[PDB]
Coordinates of C-alpha atoms and ligand atoms in Angstrom, one line a residue:
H20 CA 108.8 68.6 119.0
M21 CA 105.9 68.1 121.3
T22 CA 106.3 71.7 122.6
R23 CA 103.5 74.1 121.9
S24 CA 103.0 77.8 122.8
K25 CA 100.5 79.9 124.6
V26 CA 99.5 82.7 122.2
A27 CA 97.6 85.9 122.8
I28 CA 95.9 87.4 119.8
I29 CA 94.8 91.0 119.8
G30 CA 91.8 91.6 117.5
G31 CA 89.1 89.2 116.2
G32 CA 88.8 90.5 112.6
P33 CA 90.0 88.3 109.7
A34 CA 93.7 88.5 110.7
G35 CA 92.9 87.5 114.3
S36 CA 90.4 84.7 113.5
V37 CA 92.6 83.1 110.7
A38 CA 95.7 83.4 112.9
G39 CA 93.8 81.6 115.8
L40 CA 92.3 78.9 113.6
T41 CA 95.7 78.2 112.0
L42 CA 97.6 78.2 115.4
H43 CA 94.9 75.8 116.9
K44 CA 95.2 73.4 113.9
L45 CA 99.0 73.6 114.5
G46 CA 98.3 72.4 118.1
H47 CA 98.9 75.7 120.0
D48 CA 96.9 77.2 122.8
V49 CA 95.1 80.4 121.6
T50 CA 93.3 83.3 123.2
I51 CA 91.6 86.1 121.2
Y52 CA 90.9 89.5 122.7
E53 CA 88.4 91.6 120.7
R54 CA 87.4 95.0 122.1
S55 CA 84.0 95.1 120.3
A56 CA 80.9 93.1 120.5
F57 CA 80.1 91.1 117.3
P58 CA 78.5 91.7 114.9
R59 CA 80.0 95.1 114.3
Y60 CA 79.9 97.1 111.1
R61 CA 83.1 97.2 109.0
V62 CA 84.0 98.4 105.5
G63 CA 86.2 96.3 103.2
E64 CA 83.8 94.0 101.5
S65 CA 85.3 92.5 98.3
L66 CA 87.3 89.3 98.7
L67 CA 89.8 87.3 96.6
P68 CA 90.2 83.6 95.6
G69 CA 93.4 83.3 97.6
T70 CA 91.5 83.9 100.8
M71 CA 88.7 81.4 100.0
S72 CA 91.4 78.9 99.3
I73 CA 92.7 79.5 102.8
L74 CA 89.4 79.3 104.5
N75 CA 88.6 76.1 102.6
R76 CA 91.9 74.5 103.8
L77 CA 91.0 75.5 107.4
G78 CA 87.6 73.7 107.0
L79 CA 85.1 76.4 106.6
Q80 CA 83.8 75.5 103.1
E81 CA 80.4 74.2 104.2
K82 CA 79.7 77.1 106.6
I83 CA 80.7 79.5 103.8
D84 CA 78.5 77.8 101.1
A85 CA 75.7 78.1 103.7
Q86 CA 76.0 81.9 103.7
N87 CA 75.1 82.4 100.0
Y88 CA 77.5 85.3 99.6
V89 CA 77.2 87.2 96.3
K90 CA 79.7 85.6 93.9
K91 CA 82.5 87.7 92.3
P92 CA 83.9 86.6 88.9
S93 CA 86.3 89.4 88.5
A94 CA 87.1 93.1 89.0
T95 CA 86.1 95.7 86.3
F96 CA 87.9 99.0 85.9
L97 CA 86.8 102.2 84.1
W98 CA 90.2 103.7 84.1
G99 CA 90.9 107.1 82.7
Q100 CA 88.5 109.1 80.5
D101 CA 87.3 107.8 77.2
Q102 CA 89.0 104.4 77.6
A103 CA 87.5 101.1 76.8
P104 CA 86.7 99.2 80.0
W105 CA 88.9 96.4 81.3
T106 CA 88.3 93.4 83.4
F107 CA 90.6 91.2 85.6
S108 CA 89.2 87.7 85.4
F109 CA 89.5 85.3 88.4
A110 CA 89.6 82.3 85.9
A111 CA 92.1 79.6 86.9
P112 CA 92.4 75.7 86.7
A115 CA 94.3 71.4 93.3
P116 CA 90.8 71.2 95.2
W117 CA 91.5 74.6 97.1
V118 CA 92.3 76.6 93.9
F119 CA 89.4 79.0 93.4
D120 CA 88.2 80.6 90.2
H121 CA 86.0 83.2 92.0
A122 CA 85.6 84.9 95.3
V123 CA 82.7 86.7 97.0
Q124 CA 81.4 89.9 98.3
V125 CA 80.4 90.1 102.0
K126 CA 78.8 92.2 104.7
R127 CA 81.9 92.3 107.0
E128 CA 79.9 92.4 110.3
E129 CA 78.5 88.9 109.3
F130 CA 81.6 87.4 107.7
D131 CA 83.9 88.5 110.6
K132 CA 81.5 87.0 113.1
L133 CA 81.3 83.7 111.2
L134 CA 85.1 83.3 111.5
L135 CA 85.2 84.2 115.1
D136 CA 82.3 81.8 116.0
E137 CA 84.1 79.1 114.1
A138 CA 87.1 79.8 116.4
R139 CA 84.9 79.5 119.5
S140 CA 83.5 76.1 118.3
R141 CA 87.0 74.7 118.1
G142 CA 87.6 75.5 121.7
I143 CA 89.7 78.6 121.1
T144 CA 89.1 81.0 123.9
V145 CA 87.5 84.2 122.7
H146 CA 86.8 87.3 124.8
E147 CA 84.6 89.9 123.1
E148 CA 84.2 93.4 124.6
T149 CA 87.7 92.9 126.1
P150 CA 90.1 95.6 124.7
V151 CA 93.9 95.0 125.1
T152 CA 95.0 98.1 126.8
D153 CA 98.7 97.6 127.1
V154 CA 101.3 95.1 125.7
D155 CA 104.6 94.7 127.5
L156 CA 107.5 93.1 125.7
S157 CA 110.3 94.3 127.9
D158 CA 110.6 91.0 129.7
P159 CA 112.5 89.0 127.1
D160 CA 111.0 85.6 128.3
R161 CA 107.4 86.4 128.0
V162 CA 104.7 88.8 126.8
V163 CA 102.4 90.5 129.3
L164 CA 99.1 92.1 128.2
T165 CA 96.9 94.4 130.1
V166 CA 93.2 93.8 129.3
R167 CA 90.0 95.6 130.4
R168 CA 87.6 92.9 131.8
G169 CA 84.5 94.5 133.2
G170 CA 85.9 97.9 134.4
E171 CA 89.0 96.2 135.9
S172 CA 92.4 96.0 134.4
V173 CA 93.4 92.4 134.2
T174 CA 96.9 91.2 133.4
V175 CA 97.7 88.1 131.2
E176 CA 101.0 86.4 130.2
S177 CA 101.8 84.4 127.1
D178 CA 104.8 83.0 125.1
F179 CA 103.8 85.0 121.9
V180 CA 101.6 87.8 120.9
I181 CA 100.0 88.5 117.5
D182 CA 98.8 92.1 116.9
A183 CA 95.9 91.7 114.6
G184 CA 94.3 94.8 116.0
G185 CA 93.9 96.6 112.6
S186 CA 95.1 100.1 111.9
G187 CA 94.5 100.9 115.6
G188 CA 96.6 97.9 116.8
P189 CA 98.7 98.8 119.8
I190 CA 102.1 97.4 118.9
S191 CA 103.1 99.4 115.9
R192 CA 102.0 102.5 117.7
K193 CA 103.8 101.6 120.9
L194 CA 107.0 100.9 119.0
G195 CA 106.7 103.9 116.7
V196 CA 107.7 101.8 113.7
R197 CA 104.8 102.7 111.4
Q198 CA 106.0 104.4 108.2
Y199 CA 103.2 106.3 106.5
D200 CA 103.5 106.7 102.8
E201 CA 104.7 110.1 101.8
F202 CA 102.0 110.4 99.1
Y203 CA 99.3 107.7 99.1
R204 CA 97.1 109.4 101.7
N205 CA 93.7 108.3 100.7
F206 CA 90.5 109.4 102.4
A207 CA 87.2 107.5 101.8
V208 CA 83.5 108.4 101.9
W209 CA 80.9 105.8 101.2
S210 CA 77.3 104.7 101.5
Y211 CA 74.8 102.0 100.2
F212 CA 72.2 102.0 97.5
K213 CA 69.3 99.8 96.6
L214 CA 70.0 98.7 93.1
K215 CA 70.0 95.4 91.3
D216 CA 73.1 94.4 89.4
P217 CA 72.4 95.8 85.9
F218 CA 74.3 93.0 84.2
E219 CA 73.4 89.4 83.4
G220 CA 76.4 88.2 81.6
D221 CA 80.0 87.6 82.7
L222 CA 79.8 91.1 84.3
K223 CA 77.5 90.1 87.1
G224 CA 78.9 90.5 90.6
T225 CA 82.0 92.3 89.3
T226 CA 83.7 95.0 91.5
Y227 CA 83.7 98.4 89.6
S228 CA 86.5 100.9 90.1
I229 CA 85.9 104.2 88.3
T230 CA 88.1 107.2 87.9
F231 CA 86.9 110.8 88.0
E232 CA 88.7 114.2 88.6
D233 CA 89.4 113.9 92.3
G234 CA 90.0 110.1 92.6
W235 CA 88.0 106.9 92.1
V236 CA 84.6 105.4 92.9
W237 CA 83.9 101.7 94.0
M238 CA 80.7 99.9 93.4
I239 CA 80.4 96.4 95.1
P240 CA 77.3 94.2 95.0
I241 CA 77.0 92.8 98.5
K242 CA 73.5 91.5 97.9
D243 CA 71.0 90.9 95.2
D244 CA 69.9 94.5 95.3
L245 CA 72.5 96.1 97.6
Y246 CA 75.6 98.0 96.4
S247 CA 78.4 99.5 98.5
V248 CA 79.4 102.8 96.7
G249 CA 82.5 104.6 97.9
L250 CA 84.7 107.6 97.0
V251 CA 88.4 107.4 97.3
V252 CA 89.8 111.0 97.3
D253 CA 92.9 112.7 98.6
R254 CA 93.3 113.6 102.3
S255 CA 93.3 117.3 101.2
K256 CA 89.5 116.9 100.9
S257 CA 89.3 116.4 104.7
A258 CA 88.7 120.1 105.2
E259 CA 85.7 120.2 102.8
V260 CA 84.0 117.4 104.5
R261 CA 84.7 118.9 107.9
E262 CA 83.3 122.2 106.8
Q263 CA 80.4 121.1 104.6
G264 CA 79.4 117.8 106.1
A265 CA 79.9 114.2 104.8
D266 CA 76.4 114.0 103.2
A267 CA 76.8 117.1 101.1
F268 CA 80.4 116.1 100.1
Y269 CA 79.3 112.6 99.2
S270 CA 76.4 113.5 96.8
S271 CA 78.1 116.4 95.1
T272 CA 81.3 114.5 94.6
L273 CA 79.6 111.3 93.4
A274 CA 77.6 113.4 90.9
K275 CA 81.0 114.3 89.2
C276 CA 81.5 110.6 88.1
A277 CA 79.3 110.3 85.1
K278 CA 79.8 106.5 84.4
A279 CA 79.0 105.9 88.1
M280 CA 75.8 108.0 88.0
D281 CA 75.1 106.2 84.7
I282 CA 75.0 102.8 86.5
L283 CA 73.4 104.1 89.7
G284 CA 70.5 105.9 87.9
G285 CA 68.0 107.2 90.5
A286 CA 68.6 104.2 92.8
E287 CA 67.8 104.9 96.4
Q288 CA 70.5 105.7 99.0
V289 CA 69.7 103.3 101.8
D290 CA 72.2 104.1 104.6
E291 CA 74.1 106.9 106.2
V292 CA 77.5 108.0 104.8
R293 CA 80.7 107.2 106.7
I294 CA 84.2 108.4 106.3
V295 CA 87.7 107.3 107.2
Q296 CA 91.4 108.1 106.6
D297 CA 92.9 105.1 104.8
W298 CA 96.5 106.0 104.2
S299 CA 99.0 103.5 102.9
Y300 CA 101.9 102.7 105.4
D301 CA 104.2 99.8 106.2
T302 CA 106.4 99.1 109.3
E303 CA 110.1 99.1 110.0
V304 CA 109.4 95.8 111.8
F305 CA 106.8 93.2 110.8
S306 CA 107.8 90.9 113.7
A307 CA 110.7 90.3 116.1
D308 CA 111.3 88.5 119.4
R309 CA 107.9 87.3 120.7
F310 CA 105.5 89.4 118.5
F311 CA 104.1 89.3 115.0
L312 CA 102.0 92.0 113.4
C313 CA 99.3 90.7 110.9
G314 CA 97.0 92.6 108.5
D315 CA 96.4 96.3 108.9
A316 CA 98.3 96.2 112.2
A317 CA 101.4 95.6 110.0
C318 CA 100.7 97.5 106.8
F319 CA 97.8 99.0 104.7
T320 CA 97.5 98.9 101.0
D321 CA 95.3 101.2 98.8
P322 CA 92.2 99.1 98.4
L323 CA 92.0 99.6 94.6
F324 CA 92.8 95.8 94.1
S325 CA 90.9 94.7 97.2
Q326 CA 94.0 93.1 98.7
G327 CA 93.4 94.0 102.3
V328 CA 91.5 90.9 103.7
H329 CA 93.8 88.7 101.6
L330 CA 97.0 90.1 103.1
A331 CA 95.4 89.9 106.6
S332 CA 94.6 86.2 105.9
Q333 CA 97.9 85.3 104.3
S334 CA 100.1 87.0 107.0
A335 CA 97.9 85.5 109.7
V336 CA 98.6 82.0 108.3
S337 CA 102.3 82.9 108.0
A338 CA 102.6 84.3 111.5
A339 CA 100.9 81.1 112.8
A340 CA 103.3 78.8 110.9
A341 CA 106.2 81.0 112.0
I342 CA 105.3 80.8 115.7
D343 CA 105.0 77.0 115.3
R344 CA 108.4 76.7 113.7
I345 CA 110.1 78.8 116.3
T346 CA 108.4 76.9 119.1
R347 CA 109.7 73.5 117.8
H348 CA 113.1 74.8 116.6
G349 CA 114.2 77.7 118.8
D350 CA 117.6 78.0 117.2
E351 CA 115.8 79.1 113.9
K352 CA 114.3 82.2 115.7
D353 CA 116.2 84.8 113.7
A354 CA 115.9 83.1 110.4
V355 CA 112.1 82.7 110.8
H356 CA 111.6 86.3 111.7
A357 CA 113.8 87.4 108.8
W358 CA 111.6 85.2 106.6
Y359 CA 108.3 86.7 107.9
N360 CA 109.7 90.3 107.5
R361 CA 111.1 89.8 104.0
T362 CA 108.0 88.1 102.8
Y363 CA 105.6 90.8 104.0
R364 CA 107.8 93.6 102.9
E365 CA 108.1 92.3 99.4
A366 CA 104.3 91.8 99.1
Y367 CA 103.8 95.4 100.3
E368 CA 106.5 97.0 98.1
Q369 CA 105.5 95.3 95.0
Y370 CA 101.8 96.0 95.3
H371 CA 102.9 99.7 95.8
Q372 CA 105.1 99.7 92.6
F373 CA 102.3 98.2 90.7
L374 CA 99.8 100.7 92.0
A375 CA 102.1 103.5 90.9
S376 CA 101.8 102.2 87.3
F377 CA 98.0 102.1 87.4
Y378 CA 97.6 105.6 88.9
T379 CA 100.1 106.9 86.2
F380 CA 98.0 105.5 83.4
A381 CA 94.8 107.1 84.6
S382 CA 96.7 110.4 85.1
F383 CA 97.2 110.8 81.3
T384 CA 93.4 111.3 80.9
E385 CA 92.4 112.7 84.3
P386 CA 92.9 116.4 85.2
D387 CA 95.9 117.6 87.1
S388 CA 94.2 117.6 90.5
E389 CA 96.1 117.0 93.8
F390 CA 94.8 113.4 93.8
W391 CA 96.4 112.4 90.5
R392 CA 99.5 114.6 91.0
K393 CA 100.4 113.0 94.4
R394 CA 100.0 109.5 93.0
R395 CA 101.3 109.5 89.5
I396 CA 104.9 108.7 88.9
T397 CA 107.4 111.6 89.5
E398 CA 109.9 112.0 86.7
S399 CA 111.4 114.5 84.2
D400 CA 109.1 116.5 81.7
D401 CA 110.8 114.4 79.0
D402 CA 110.5 110.9 80.7
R403 CA 106.8 111.8 81.0
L404 CA 106.1 112.9 77.4
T405 CA 108.0 109.7 76.3
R406 CA 105.6 107.9 78.7
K407 CA 102.8 108.9 76.4
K408 CA 104.2 105.9 74.6
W409 CA 100.9 105.1 76.4
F410 CA 98.8 107.0 73.8
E411 CA 99.1 103.8 71.7
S412 CA 98.5 100.5 73.5
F428 CA 105.2 96.4 87.2
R429 CA 104.2 99.1 84.7
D430 CA 104.7 97.0 81.6
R431 CA 103.3 94.4 84.0
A432 CA 100.2 96.6 84.4
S433 CA 100.2 97.6 80.8
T434 CA 99.9 93.9 80.2
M435 CA 97.0 93.3 82.5
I436 CA 95.0 96.2 81.0
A437 CA 95.6 95.0 77.4
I438 CA 94.6 91.4 78.2
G439 CA 91.5 92.6 80.0
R440 CA 90.5 95.2 77.4
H441 CA 86.8 95.0 76.4
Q442 CA 86.4 94.8 72.6
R443 CA 84.1 97.8 72.3
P444 CA 84.4 101.5 73.6
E445 CA 81.8 101.3 76.3
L446 CA 80.6 99.0 79.1
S447 CA 77.8 96.6 78.0
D448 CA 76.3 93.2 78.8
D449 CA 77.6 92.2 75.4
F450 CA 80.8 91.5 77.3
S451 CA 81.9 87.9 77.7
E452 CA 85.2 86.8 79.3
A453 CA 85.9 84.7 76.2
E454 CA 86.3 88.0 74.2
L455 CA 89.5 88.4 76.2
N456 CA 91.0 85.1 75.1
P457 CA 92.7 86.4 72.0
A458 CA 94.7 89.1 73.8
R459 CA 95.6 86.6 76.4
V460 CA 96.8 84.1 73.9
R461 CA 98.6 86.8 71.9
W462 CA 100.5 87.6 75.1
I463 CA 101.5 84.0 75.6
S464 CA 102.6 83.7 71.9
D465 CA 104.7 86.8 72.4
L466 CA 106.3 85.3 75.5
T467 CA 106.9 82.0 73.7
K468 CA 108.4 83.9 70.8
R469 CA 110.8 85.8 73.1
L470 CA 112.0 82.8 75.1
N471 CA 112.6 80.9 71.8
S472 CA 114.7 83.8 70.4
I473 CA 117.1 83.4 73.3
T474 CA 120.3 81.8 72.0
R475 CA 122.5 82.9 74.9
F476 CA 121.9 83.2 78.7
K477 CA 124.2 84.8 81.2
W478 CA 124.1 84.2 85.0
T479 CA 124.5 87.0 87.5
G480 CA 127.7 86.2 89.5
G481 CA 130.0 83.3 88.8
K482 CA 128.4 80.8 91.2
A483 CA 125.1 79.0 91.3
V484 CA 124.1 78.0 94.9
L485 CA 121.4 76.5 97.0
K486 CA 120.2 78.8 99.8
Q487 CA 117.8 78.1 102.7
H488 CA 114.2 79.3 102.5
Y489 CA 110.8 78.7 104.2
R490 CA 107.5 77.9 102.7
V491 CA 104.1 77.3 104.3
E492 CA 102.9 73.8 103.3
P493 CA 99.3 74.5 102.0
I494 CA 97.5 71.4 103.4
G495 CA 98.7 71.3 107.0
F496 CA 100.1 74.8 107.3
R497 CA 103.5 73.9 108.7
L498 CA 106.5 76.0 107.9
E499 CA 108.9 73.8 106.0
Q500 CA 112.5 74.3 105.0
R501 CA 113.3 74.4 101.3
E502 CA 116.5 75.1 99.3
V503 CA 116.1 77.6 96.5
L504 CA 118.4 78.8 93.7
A505 CA 120.6 81.8 94.4
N506 CA 123.9 83.3 93.4
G507 CA 126.9 83.9 95.7
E508 CA 125.6 87.4 96.4
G509 CA 122.4 86.2 97.9
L510 CA 120.1 87.1 95.0
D511 CA 117.5 84.4 94.7
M512 CA 114.3 83.0 93.2
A513 CA 112.4 81.6 96.1
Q514 CA 109.2 80.4 94.3
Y515 CA 110.7 76.9 93.4
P516 CA 112.5 74.2 95.4
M517 CA 115.7 73.0 93.8
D518 CA 118.4 70.4 94.6
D519 CA 122.2 70.0 94.0
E520 CA 121.2 68.5 90.8
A521 CA 119.3 71.4 89.3
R522 CA 121.9 73.7 90.7
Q523 CA 124.4 72.1 88.5
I524 CA 122.4 73.0 85.5
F525 CA 122.8 76.7 86.4
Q526 CA 126.5 76.5 87.2
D527 CA 127.0 75.0 83.7
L528 CA 124.9 77.8 82.4
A529 CA 127.0 80.5 84.2
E530 CA 130.1 79.0 82.6
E531 CA 129.0 78.0 79.0
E532 CA 126.1 80.5 78.5
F533 CA 123.9 78.1 76.5
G534 CA 120.5 79.3 75.3
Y535 CA 116.8 78.6 76.1
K536 CA 116.6 75.3 74.1
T537 CA 119.4 73.8 76.2
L538 CA 118.0 75.1 79.4
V539 CA 114.5 73.6 78.8
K540 CA 116.1 70.2 77.9
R541 CA 118.3 70.1 81.0
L542 CA 115.4 71.0 83.2
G543 CA 113.1 68.3 81.6
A544 CA 115.9 65.8 82.1
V545 CA 115.7 66.3 85.9
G546 CA 111.9 66.0 86.3
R547 CA 111.0 69.7 85.9
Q548 CA 109.6 69.7 82.3
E549 CA 106.2 71.1 83.4
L550 CA 107.7 74.0 85.4
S551 CA 110.6 74.9 83.1
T552 CA 108.8 77.9 81.5
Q553 CA 107.9 79.3 84.9
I554 CA 111.4 78.6 86.3
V555 CA 113.2 80.5 83.6
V556 CA 110.7 83.4 83.6
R557 CA 111.1 83.7 87.4
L558 CA 114.9 83.6 87.1
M559 CA 114.7 86.3 84.5
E560 CA 112.4 88.5 86.8
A561 CA 114.7 87.8 89.7
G562 CA 117.6 89.3 87.7
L563 CA 119.5 85.9 87.9
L564 CA 119.2 85.2 84.1
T565 CA 119.7 87.7 81.3
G566 CA 118.8 86.6 77.8
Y567 CA 120.3 87.6 74.5
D568 CA 118.9 87.1 71.0
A569 CA 120.8 85.8 67.9
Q570 CA 121.7 89.4 67.0
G571 CA 123.1 90.0 70.5
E572 CA 120.3 92.3 71.8
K573 CA 119.0 91.7 75.3
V574 CA 115.6 89.9 75.5
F575 CA 113.1 91.2 78.1
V576 CA 110.7 88.8 79.7
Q577 CA 108.1 89.2 82.5
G578 CA 105.2 86.7 83.0
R579 CA 103.4 88.2 85.9
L580 CA 100.0 89.9 85.8
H581 CA 97.9 88.7 88.7
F582 CA 98.1 91.1 91.8
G583 CA 98.3 88.5 94.6
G584 CA 95.5 86.3 95.9
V585 CA 94.4 85.5 92.4
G586 CA 95.4 82.7 90.0
Ligands
FAD601 C1 89.4 101.6 104.5 C2 89.0 100.6 103.5 C3 89.6 99.3 103.5 C4 89.2 98.4 102.6 C5 88.2 98.7 101.6 C6 87.7 100.0 101.6 C7 88.1 101.0 102.5 C8 87.6 102.4 102.4 N1 87.9 97.8 100.7 C9 88.4 96.5 100.8 C10 88.0 95.5 99.9 O1 87.1 95.7 99.0 N2 88.5 94.3 100.0 C11 89.4 94.0 101.0 O2 89.9 92.9 101.1 N3 89.8 94.9 101.9 C12 89.4 96.2 101.8 N4 89.7 97.1 102.7 C13 90.8 96.9 103.7 C14 90.4 95.9 104.7 O3 89.2 96.1 105.2 C15 91.4 95.6 105.8 O4 92.7 95.3 105.2 C16 91.0 94.4 106.7 O5 89.8 94.8 107.4 C17 92.0 94.1 107.7 O6 91.7 93.0 108.5 P1 92.3 93.0 110.0 O7 91.9 91.7 110.7 O8 93.8 93.3 109.9 O9 91.8 94.3 110.7 P2 90.3 94.7 111.1 O10 89.3 94.2 110.1 O11 90.3 96.2 111.3 O12 90.1 93.9 112.5 C18 90.8 94.3 113.6 C19 90.0 94.1 114.9 O13 90.8 94.5 116.1 C20 90.0 95.0 117.1 N5 90.9 95.8 117.9 C21 91.5 97.0 117.7 N6 92.3 97.3 118.7 C22 92.1 96.4 119.7 C23 92.6 96.3 121.0 N7 93.4 97.2 121.5 N8 92.2 95.2 121.8 C24 91.3 94.3 121.3 N9 90.8 94.4 120.0 C25 91.2 95.4 119.2 C26 88.9 95.8 116.3 O14 87.8 95.9 117.1 C27 88.7 95.0 115.0 O15 87.6 94.2 115.1

């Protein structure tokens, strides 16, 4: 209980800094090894509310307010050809809950976090690459580090690899699993251009489909836009052959709505490229190591999840190391929790992504980009799927409908309030479906409490919580339940009462304000199935934020 660990951290990007700040607040002894000198240039500029929340709870609010980062209200999508625009609002009602995020210059943002780490007495070595990581001694971790021109050797109780896509551990272990099809390749530059919108659109992140993929437009200053192409890795050869500059301009010129908003603006930087393929890992952590951020997995940046998942996993890996340090018998359970949680985030962002790419594929040409990414299924499943012609994948269908602008084209006429009717209409539809449920069935014959972990948001400790499950381990981990609320569900499994009874029984035990969320989550978890008065199944899903929002 008074025991704390010595922890080496490879990499001082967002995963590294957040991991070190969190481990320090949890009372551990942190060293961060970063191979570069800061500031150093880095792409990946558009952030999420969930990450601001984390930084706020770690005490960075004043330093961040000081920076005057461009504020981001939402993300806007021009998705498919001749489609109305849609926007994903960051609108949301605790002190750390954020309704917006920001856009940053990563060289400055990353250096701000790292300098904060320094100021708290965390040891930081810049220009000190970690050259080898040895885990074969089960009692310790030993790193080899290049200090000056000398190899120096250092031991620690734990190691976090936050070294980004080039982190040494996943490579060393050979546990990286590249996605078979999501092999994105990016080519980008900067323009001098002032946000052309004054209304609710100002500061929004634009993602815009064309023949060979999509274009991003991020305002990182008053008059500065990051403008990137995401294309298939099959375009590597063209860039190799014809040069990135020529590839960049002739490709970007193919995206009319993008040239539309650009309009003669001046290109104000060189163009860079990189391979950004999706991949996860067989192992997110085991024994004395954790992988965090791109070192663990990489998600197609369409929804700007990257820095958020680096931050979230960094906080989780910190809490995990703390828990194991104070309760060493829980080692296996804690690693199983870290692996499950990261895997589930990765896999469900991927499933969701597949939906979005498929929707654009109906109006974009049959290029290798769209063909690799759109859902694979029978000629007949696909023609049926132009059920789309007339509006995870209903989850995405939902988001798009709610966010649909009420005119055919993108304009400063847009206000987020014009989205309120479709929102409300979705809520009324959800309310209508739940109310029609006169009979519920439980999956299995037993309702049980199962052990689960949760990071406490204020102090960051990993706490134990009992969640609802069946005998066969299926669970709904998002809410803490007791023997008392479990009884509710055992009675349900036996008597199969409907929605009205379930709401009442929940209210009766203090859970009146969560009850709608509780039953929706149980439905999505496949633990509850609902039936209407005519005996037909009733399908409910109430998701529709992508992670790090709302
Ligand atoms: C590729 C890409 C990614 C991207 C993006 C657009 C593109 C083309 N747009 C994004 C966006 O709009 N919003 C967002 O949140 N993310 C976006 N991304 C992805 C995102 O940039 C990454 O997920 C994020 O950078 C990951 O953070 P993480 O902390 O995991 O990794 P990092 O930023 O690469 O930092 C790693 C540091 O480690 C150092 N390093 C590497 N190896 C060593 C060794 N061996 N020893 C010591 N240090 C090491 C690197 O120097 C780096 O600083």
